[PDB]
Coordinates of C-alpha atoms in Angstrom, one line a residue:
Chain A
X191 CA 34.7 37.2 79.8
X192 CA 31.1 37.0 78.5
X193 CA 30.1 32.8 77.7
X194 CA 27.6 30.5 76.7
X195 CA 28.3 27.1 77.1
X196 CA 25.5 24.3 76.2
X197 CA 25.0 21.0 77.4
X198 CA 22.1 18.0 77.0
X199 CA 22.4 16.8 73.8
X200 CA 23.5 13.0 72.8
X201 CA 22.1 9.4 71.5
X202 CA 18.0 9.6 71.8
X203 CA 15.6 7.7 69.6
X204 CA 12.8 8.7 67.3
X205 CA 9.7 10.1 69.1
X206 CA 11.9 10.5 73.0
X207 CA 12.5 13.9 74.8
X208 CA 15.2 15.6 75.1
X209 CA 16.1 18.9 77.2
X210 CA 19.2 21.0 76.2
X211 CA 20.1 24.1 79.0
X212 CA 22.2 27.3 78.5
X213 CA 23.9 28.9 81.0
X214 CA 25.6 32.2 80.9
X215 CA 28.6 33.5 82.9
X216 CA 29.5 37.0 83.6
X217 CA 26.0 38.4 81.9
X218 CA 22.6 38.1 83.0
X219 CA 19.8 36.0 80.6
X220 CA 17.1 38.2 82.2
X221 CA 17.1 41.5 80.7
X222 CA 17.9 39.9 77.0
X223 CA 17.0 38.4 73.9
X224 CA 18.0 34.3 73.9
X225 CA 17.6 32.6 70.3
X226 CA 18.3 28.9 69.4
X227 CA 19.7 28.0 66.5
X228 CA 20.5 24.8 65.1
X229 CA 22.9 23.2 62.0
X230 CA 22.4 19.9 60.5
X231 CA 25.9 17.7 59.4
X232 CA 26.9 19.5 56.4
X233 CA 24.1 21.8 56.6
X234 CA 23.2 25.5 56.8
X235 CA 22.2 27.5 60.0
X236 CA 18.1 26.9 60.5
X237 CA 16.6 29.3 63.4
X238 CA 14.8 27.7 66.1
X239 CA 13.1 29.7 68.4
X240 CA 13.6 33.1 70.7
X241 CA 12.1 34.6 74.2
X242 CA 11.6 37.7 74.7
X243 CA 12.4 39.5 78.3
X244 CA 9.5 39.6 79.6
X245 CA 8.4 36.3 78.4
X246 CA 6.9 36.2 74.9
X247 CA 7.9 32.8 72.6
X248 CA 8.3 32.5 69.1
X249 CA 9.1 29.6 67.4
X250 CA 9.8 28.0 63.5
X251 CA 7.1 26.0 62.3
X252 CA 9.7 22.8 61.4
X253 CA 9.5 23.1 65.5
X254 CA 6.3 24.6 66.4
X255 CA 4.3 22.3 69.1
X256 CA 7.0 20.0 69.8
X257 CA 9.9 22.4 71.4
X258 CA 10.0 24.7 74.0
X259 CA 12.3 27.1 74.9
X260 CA 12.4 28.0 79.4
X261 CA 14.3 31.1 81.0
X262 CA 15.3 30.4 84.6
X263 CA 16.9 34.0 86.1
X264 CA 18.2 31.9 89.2
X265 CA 20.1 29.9 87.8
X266 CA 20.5 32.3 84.7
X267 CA 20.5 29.7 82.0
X268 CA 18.4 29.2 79.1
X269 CA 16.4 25.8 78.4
X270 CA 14.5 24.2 75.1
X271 CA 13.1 21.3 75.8
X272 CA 12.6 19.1 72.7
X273 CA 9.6 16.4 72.6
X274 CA 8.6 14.1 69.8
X275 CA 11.8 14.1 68.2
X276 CA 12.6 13.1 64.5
X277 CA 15.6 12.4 62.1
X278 CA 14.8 15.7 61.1
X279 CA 16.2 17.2 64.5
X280 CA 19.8 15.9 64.8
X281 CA 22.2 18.6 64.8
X282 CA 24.3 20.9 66.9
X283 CA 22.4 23.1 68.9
X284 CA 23.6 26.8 69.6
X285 CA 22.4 29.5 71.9
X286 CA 22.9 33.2 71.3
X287 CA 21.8 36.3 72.4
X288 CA 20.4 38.4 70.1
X289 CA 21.0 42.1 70.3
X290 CA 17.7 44.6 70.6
X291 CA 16.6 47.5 68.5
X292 CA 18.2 50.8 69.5
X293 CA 14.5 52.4 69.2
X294 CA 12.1 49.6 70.3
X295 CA 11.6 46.7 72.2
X296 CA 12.2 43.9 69.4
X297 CA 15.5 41.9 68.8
X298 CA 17.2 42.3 66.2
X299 CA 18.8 39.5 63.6
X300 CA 22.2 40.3 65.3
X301 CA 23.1 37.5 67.3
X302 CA 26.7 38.5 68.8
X303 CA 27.5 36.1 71.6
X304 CA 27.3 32.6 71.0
X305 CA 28.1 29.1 72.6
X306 CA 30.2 26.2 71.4
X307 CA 26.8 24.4 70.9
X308 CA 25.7 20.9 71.6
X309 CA 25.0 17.6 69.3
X310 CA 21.7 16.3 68.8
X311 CA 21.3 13.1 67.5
X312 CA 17.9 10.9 67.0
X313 CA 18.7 7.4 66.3
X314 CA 17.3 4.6 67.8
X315 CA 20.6 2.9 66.4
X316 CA 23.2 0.8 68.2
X317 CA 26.4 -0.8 67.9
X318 CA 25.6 -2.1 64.2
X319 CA 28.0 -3.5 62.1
X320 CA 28.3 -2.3 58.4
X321 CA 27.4 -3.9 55.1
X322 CA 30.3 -3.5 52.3
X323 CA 29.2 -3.3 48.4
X324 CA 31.0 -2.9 45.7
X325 CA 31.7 0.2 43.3
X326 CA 32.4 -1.7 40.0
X327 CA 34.8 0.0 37.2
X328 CA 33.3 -0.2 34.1
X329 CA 32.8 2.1 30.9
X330 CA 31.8 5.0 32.8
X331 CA 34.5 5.0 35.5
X332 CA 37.3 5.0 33.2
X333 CA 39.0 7.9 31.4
X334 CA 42.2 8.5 30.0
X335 CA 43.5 5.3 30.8
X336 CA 43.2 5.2 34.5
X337 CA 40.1 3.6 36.5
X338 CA 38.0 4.7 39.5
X339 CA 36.9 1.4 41.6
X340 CA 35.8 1.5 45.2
X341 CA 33.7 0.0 47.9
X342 CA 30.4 1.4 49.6
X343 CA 30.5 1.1 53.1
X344 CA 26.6 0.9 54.6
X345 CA 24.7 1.2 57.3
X346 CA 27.0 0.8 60.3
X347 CA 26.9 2.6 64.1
X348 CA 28.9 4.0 65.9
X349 CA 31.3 5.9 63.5
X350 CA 34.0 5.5 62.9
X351 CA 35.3 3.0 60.0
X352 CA 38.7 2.6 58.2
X353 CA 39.6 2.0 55.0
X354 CA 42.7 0.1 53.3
X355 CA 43.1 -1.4 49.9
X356 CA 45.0 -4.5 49.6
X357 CA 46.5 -4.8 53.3
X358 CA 47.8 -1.2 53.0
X359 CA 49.7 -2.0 49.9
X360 CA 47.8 0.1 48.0
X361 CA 47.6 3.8 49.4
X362 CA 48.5 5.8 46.4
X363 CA 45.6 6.9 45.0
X364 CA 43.0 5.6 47.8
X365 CA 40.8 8.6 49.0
X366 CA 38.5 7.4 51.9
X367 CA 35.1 9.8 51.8
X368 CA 33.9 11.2 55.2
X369 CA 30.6 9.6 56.5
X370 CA 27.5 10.4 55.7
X371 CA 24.5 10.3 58.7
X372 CA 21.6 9.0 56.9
X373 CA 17.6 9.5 58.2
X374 CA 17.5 5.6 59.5
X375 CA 20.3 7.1 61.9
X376 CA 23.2 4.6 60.6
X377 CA 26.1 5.8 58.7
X378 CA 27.9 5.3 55.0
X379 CA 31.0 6.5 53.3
X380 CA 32.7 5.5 50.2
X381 CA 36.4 4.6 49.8
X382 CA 37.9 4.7 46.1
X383 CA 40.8 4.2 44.6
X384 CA 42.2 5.1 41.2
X385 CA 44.1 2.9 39.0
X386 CA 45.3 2.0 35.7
X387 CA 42.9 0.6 33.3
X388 CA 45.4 -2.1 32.1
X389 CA 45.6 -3.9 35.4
X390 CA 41.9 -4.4 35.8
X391 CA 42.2 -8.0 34.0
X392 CA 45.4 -9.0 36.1
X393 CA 45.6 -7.2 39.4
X394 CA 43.6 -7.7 42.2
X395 CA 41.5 -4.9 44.3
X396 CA 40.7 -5.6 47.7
X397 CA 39.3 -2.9 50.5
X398 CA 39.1 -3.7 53.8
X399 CA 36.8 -2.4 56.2
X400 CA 37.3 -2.0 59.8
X401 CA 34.5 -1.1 62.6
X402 CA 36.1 -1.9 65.9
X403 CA 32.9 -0.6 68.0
X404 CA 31.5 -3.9 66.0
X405 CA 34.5 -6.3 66.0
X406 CA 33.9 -6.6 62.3
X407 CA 36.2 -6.7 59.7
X408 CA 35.1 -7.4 56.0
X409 CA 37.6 -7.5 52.9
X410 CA 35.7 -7.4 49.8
X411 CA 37.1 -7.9 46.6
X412 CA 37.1 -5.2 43.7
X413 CA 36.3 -6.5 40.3
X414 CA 34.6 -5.5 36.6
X415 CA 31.3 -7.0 37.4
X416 CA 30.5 -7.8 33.7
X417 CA 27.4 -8.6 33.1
Chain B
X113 CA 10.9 35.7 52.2
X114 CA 14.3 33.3 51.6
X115 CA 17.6 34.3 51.3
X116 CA 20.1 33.1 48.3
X117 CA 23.6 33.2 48.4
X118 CA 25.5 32.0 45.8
X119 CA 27.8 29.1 46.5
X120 CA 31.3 30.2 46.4
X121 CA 33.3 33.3 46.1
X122 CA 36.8 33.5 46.0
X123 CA 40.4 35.9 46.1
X124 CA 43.9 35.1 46.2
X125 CA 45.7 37.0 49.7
X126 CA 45.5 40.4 49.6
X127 CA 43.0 40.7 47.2
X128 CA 39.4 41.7 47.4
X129 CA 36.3 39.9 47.3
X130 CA 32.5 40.7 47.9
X131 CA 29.2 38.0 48.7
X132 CA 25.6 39.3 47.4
X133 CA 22.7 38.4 49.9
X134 CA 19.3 38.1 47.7
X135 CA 15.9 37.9 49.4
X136 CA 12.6 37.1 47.7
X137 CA 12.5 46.3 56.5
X138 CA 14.7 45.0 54.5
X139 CA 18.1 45.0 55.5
X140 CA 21.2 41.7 56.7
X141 CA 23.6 40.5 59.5
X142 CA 26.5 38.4 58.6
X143 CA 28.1 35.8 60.1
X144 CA 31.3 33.6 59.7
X145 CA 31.8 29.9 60.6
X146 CA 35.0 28.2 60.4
X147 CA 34.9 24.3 60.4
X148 CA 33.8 22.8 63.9
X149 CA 33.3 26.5 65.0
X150 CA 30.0 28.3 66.4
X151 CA 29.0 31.4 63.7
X152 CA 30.6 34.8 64.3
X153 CA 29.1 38.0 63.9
X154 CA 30.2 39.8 61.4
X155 CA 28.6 42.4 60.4
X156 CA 25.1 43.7 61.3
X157 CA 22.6 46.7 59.6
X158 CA 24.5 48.1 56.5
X159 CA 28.0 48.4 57.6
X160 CA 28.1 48.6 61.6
X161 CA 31.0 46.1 63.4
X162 CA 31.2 44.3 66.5
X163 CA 34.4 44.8 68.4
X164 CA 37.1 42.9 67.8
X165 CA 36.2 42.1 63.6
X166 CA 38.6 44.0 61.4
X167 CA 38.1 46.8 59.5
X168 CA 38.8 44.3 56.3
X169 CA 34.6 43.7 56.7
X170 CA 32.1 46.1 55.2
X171 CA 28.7 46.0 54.2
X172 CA 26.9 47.4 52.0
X173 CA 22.9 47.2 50.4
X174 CA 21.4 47.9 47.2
X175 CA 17.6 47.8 47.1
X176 CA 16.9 43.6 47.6
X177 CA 21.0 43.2 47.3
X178 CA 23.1 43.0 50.5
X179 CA 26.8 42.7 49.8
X180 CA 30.0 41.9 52.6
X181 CA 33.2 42.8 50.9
X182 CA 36.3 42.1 52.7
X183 CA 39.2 43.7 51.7
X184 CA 42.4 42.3 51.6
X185 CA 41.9 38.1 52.0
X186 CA 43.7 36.6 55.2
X187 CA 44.0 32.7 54.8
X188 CA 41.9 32.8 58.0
X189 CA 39.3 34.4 56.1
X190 CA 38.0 31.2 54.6
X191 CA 35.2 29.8 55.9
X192 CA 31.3 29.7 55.5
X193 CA 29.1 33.0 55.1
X194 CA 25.5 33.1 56.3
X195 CA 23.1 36.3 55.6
X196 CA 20.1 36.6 58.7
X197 CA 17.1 39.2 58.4
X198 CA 13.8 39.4 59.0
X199 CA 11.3 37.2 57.1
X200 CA 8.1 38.0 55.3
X201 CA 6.4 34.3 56.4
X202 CA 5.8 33.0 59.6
X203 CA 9.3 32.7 60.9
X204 CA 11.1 35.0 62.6
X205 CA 14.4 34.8 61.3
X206 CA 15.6 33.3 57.8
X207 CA 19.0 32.4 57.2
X208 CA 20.8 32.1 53.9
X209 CA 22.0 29.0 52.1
X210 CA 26.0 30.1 53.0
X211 CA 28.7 31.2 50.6
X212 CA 32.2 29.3 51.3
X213 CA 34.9 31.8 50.6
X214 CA 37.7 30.4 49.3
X215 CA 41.6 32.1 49.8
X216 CA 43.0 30.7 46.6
X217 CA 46.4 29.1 47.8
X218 CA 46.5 26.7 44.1
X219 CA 45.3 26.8 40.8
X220 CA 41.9 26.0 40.0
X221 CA 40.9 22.5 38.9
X222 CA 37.7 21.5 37.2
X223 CA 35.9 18.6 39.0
X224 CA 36.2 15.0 37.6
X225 CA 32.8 12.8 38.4
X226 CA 32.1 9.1 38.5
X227 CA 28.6 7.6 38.8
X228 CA 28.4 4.3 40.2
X229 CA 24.6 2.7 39.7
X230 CA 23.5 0.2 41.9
X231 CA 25.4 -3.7 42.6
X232 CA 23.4 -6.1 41.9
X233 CA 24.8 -7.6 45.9
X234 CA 23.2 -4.3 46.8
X235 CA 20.0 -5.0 45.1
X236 CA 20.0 -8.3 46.6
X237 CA 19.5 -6.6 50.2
X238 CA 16.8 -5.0 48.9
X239 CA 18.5 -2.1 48.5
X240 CA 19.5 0.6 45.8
X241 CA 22.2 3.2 46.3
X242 CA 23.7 5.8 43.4
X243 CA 27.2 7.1 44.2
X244 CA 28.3 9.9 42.8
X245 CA 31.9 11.1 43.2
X246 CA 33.5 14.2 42.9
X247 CA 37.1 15.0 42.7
X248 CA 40.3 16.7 42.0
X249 CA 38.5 20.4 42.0
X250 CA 39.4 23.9 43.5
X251 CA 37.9 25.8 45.1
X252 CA 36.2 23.1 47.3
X253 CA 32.9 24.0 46.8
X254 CA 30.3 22.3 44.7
X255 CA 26.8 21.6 44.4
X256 CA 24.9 18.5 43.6
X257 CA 21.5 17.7 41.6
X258 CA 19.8 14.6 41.1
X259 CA 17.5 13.4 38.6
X260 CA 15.3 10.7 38.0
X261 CA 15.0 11.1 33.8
X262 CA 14.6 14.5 33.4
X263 CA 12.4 15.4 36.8
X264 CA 14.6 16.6 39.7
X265 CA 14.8 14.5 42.9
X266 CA 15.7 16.0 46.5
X267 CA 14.2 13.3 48.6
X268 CA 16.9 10.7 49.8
X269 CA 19.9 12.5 48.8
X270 CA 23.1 13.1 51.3
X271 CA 26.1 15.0 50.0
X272 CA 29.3 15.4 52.3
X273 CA 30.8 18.8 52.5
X274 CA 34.4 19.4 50.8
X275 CA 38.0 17.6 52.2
X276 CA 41.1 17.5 51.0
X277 CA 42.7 14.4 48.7
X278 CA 46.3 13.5 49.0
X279 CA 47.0 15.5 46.1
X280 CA 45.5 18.7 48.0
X281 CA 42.8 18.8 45.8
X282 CA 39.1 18.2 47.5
X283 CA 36.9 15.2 47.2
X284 CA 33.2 15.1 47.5
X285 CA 30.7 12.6 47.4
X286 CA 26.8 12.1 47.0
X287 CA 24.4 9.6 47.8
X288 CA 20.6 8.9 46.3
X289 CA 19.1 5.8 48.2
X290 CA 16.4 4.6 46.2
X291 CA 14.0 0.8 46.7
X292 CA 15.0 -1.4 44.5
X293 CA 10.9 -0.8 42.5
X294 CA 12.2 3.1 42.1
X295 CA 15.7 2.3 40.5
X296 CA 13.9 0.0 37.9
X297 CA 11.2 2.3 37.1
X298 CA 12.9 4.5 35.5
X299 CA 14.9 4.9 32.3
X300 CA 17.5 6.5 34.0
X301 CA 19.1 8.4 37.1
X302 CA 21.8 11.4 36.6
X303 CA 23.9 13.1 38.9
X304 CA 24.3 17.2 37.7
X305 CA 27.6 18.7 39.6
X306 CA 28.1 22.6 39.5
X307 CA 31.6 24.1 40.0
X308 CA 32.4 27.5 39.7
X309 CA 29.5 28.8 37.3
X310 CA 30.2 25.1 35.2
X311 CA 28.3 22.0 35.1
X312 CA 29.1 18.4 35.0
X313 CA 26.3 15.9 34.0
X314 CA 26.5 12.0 34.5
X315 CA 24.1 9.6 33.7
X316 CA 23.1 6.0 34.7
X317 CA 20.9 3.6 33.8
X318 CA 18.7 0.1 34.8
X319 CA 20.2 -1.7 31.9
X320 CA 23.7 -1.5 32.3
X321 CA 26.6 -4.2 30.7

């Protein structure tokens, strides 16, 4: 059956190079249109560039200058080298073919075979542990009687972290956020829990972060921070 | 020229539900991308198939509208929409900002959100860090605005896409990193949700407590 199957991508910092290739299995890259197209975490699908088959390059102009996209017939995979990379690149990384015109010699916006696609991500980040702040219930947090309280979890690398609230005695109501992948390359989520507005004066919150890839554990302790 | 999609669209199983693709020749592909998945072609031209996509798929286009109606909703229907055509500037290829299409499976729920401003531990670090929390809506699909007073703010915002809670209803959260000079030099920061055609405004300020 016809495939695309991607392969390159990983950790590289700010500025480095990076190449990504595309082989094809079962049909040829030669006599066909090859696009790249990548997606940004929690992001839409953002065009990146297209060869023609006899040779001719276009590319978008968030990617103009600094990428390049290859053909190589003998091996029959696609290439895009990527130079002078920024925070702005990270993301999965898909090739496709894009189907031509019936009448002319121009591709189309069809794209009908695809790969599985490959991440892309520009950190110069390492094993980092995170910082834990926290989210304070007060007037604005509280409604009908129950309370919204939680910790921030920030700046840590590599994912992932886990969340508990008092030792795991407290999971009812707990919803742990997925992580966020910020521009400084580092990661954040947010873990909250929702309780009675009463037992803010008596009971006691504590979350407690865990990022193994940093042996660090930090409980942090919940409270109105009244001012 | 860009393409806008709106945000959600949604049909309980078996019923019938259609996404507009608006672009400011002219004609749109579709594609479909379920979570961790590559896009899918849909639909290309005005109505034309690839093999293998059902016959629950049609296109259609009405001067700068494209629409993709699908027919009668599969639970494996839901997942992200993107429009492609031809652009007016200097790329070659535009895509839209994606539709999630929602198989209602539950009732719909209107979006609770909390605004945390700033710790002062946070501060401390030199740093500055609104937190705006969504939860307990369906379908799970929002979108986020930030403001600094009245004057919108785009740079240094992260939002995480839709997930479940334990209650089945979906969570969302959004970040605006700010220096500690920015959050202090305003009156105040505000964090707009939409949901379903319905907005949800809250509002935080320096001087808090």
């Amino acid at each position: 059956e016809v495939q695309l199957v991607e392969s390159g991508g990983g950790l590289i910092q700010p500025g480095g190079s990076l190449r990504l290739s595309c082989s094809a299995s079962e049909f040829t890259v030669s006599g066909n249109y090859m696009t790249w197209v990548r997606q940004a975490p929690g992001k839409g699908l953002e065009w990146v560039s297209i060869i023609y088959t006899g040779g001719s390059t276009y590319y978008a102009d968030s990617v103009k200058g600094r990428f390049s996209i290859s053909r190589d017939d003998s091996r029959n995979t696609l290439y895009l080298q990527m130079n002078s990379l920024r925070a702005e690149d990270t993301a999965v990384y898909y090739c496709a073919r894009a189907l031509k015109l019936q009448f002319f010699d121009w591709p189309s916006h069809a794209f009908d075979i695809w790969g599985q696609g490959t991440m892309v991500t520009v950190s110069s980040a390492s094993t980092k542990g995170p910082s834990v702040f926290p989210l304070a219930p007060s007037s604005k947090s509280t409604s009908g009687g129950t309370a919204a309280l939680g910790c921030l979890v920030k700046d840590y690398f590599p994912e992932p972290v886990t969340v508990s609230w008092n030792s795991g005695a407290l999971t009812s109501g707990v919803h742990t956020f997925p992580a966020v992948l910020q521009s400084s390359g580092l990661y954040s989520l947010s873990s909250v829990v929702t309780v009675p507005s009463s037992s803010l004066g008596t009971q006691t919150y504590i979350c407690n972060v865990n990022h193994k890839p940093s042996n660090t554990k930090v409980d942090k302790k919940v409270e109105p921070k009244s001012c | 020229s860009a393409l806008t999609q709106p945000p959600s669209a949604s049909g309980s199983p078996g019923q019938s539900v259609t996404i507009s693709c608006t672009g400011t020749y002219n004609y749109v592909s579709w594609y479909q991308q379920h979570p961790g998945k590559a896009p899918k072609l849909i639909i290309s031209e005005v109505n034309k198939r690839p093999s293998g996509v059902p016959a629950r798929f049609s296109g259609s286009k009405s001067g700068n509208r494209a629409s993709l109606t699908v027919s009668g909703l599969q639970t494996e229907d839901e997942a992200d929409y993107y429009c492609s055509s031809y652009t007016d500037t200097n790329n070659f290829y535009v895509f839209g900002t994606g539709t999630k299409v929602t198989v209602l499976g539950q009732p719909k729920a209107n979006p609770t959100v909390t605004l945390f401003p700033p710790s002062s531990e946070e501060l401390q670090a030199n740093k500055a860090t609104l937190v705006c929390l969504i939860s307990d809506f369906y379908p799970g699909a929002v979108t986020v605005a930030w403001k600094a007073d009245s004057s919108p703010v785009k740079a240094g915002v992260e939002t995480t896409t839709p997930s479940k809670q334990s209650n089945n209803k979906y969570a969302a959260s959004s970040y605006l990193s700010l220096t500690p000079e920015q959050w202090k030099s305003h009156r105040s920061y505000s964090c707009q949700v939409t949901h379903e055609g319905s907005t949800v405004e809250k509002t935080v300020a320096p001087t808090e407590c």
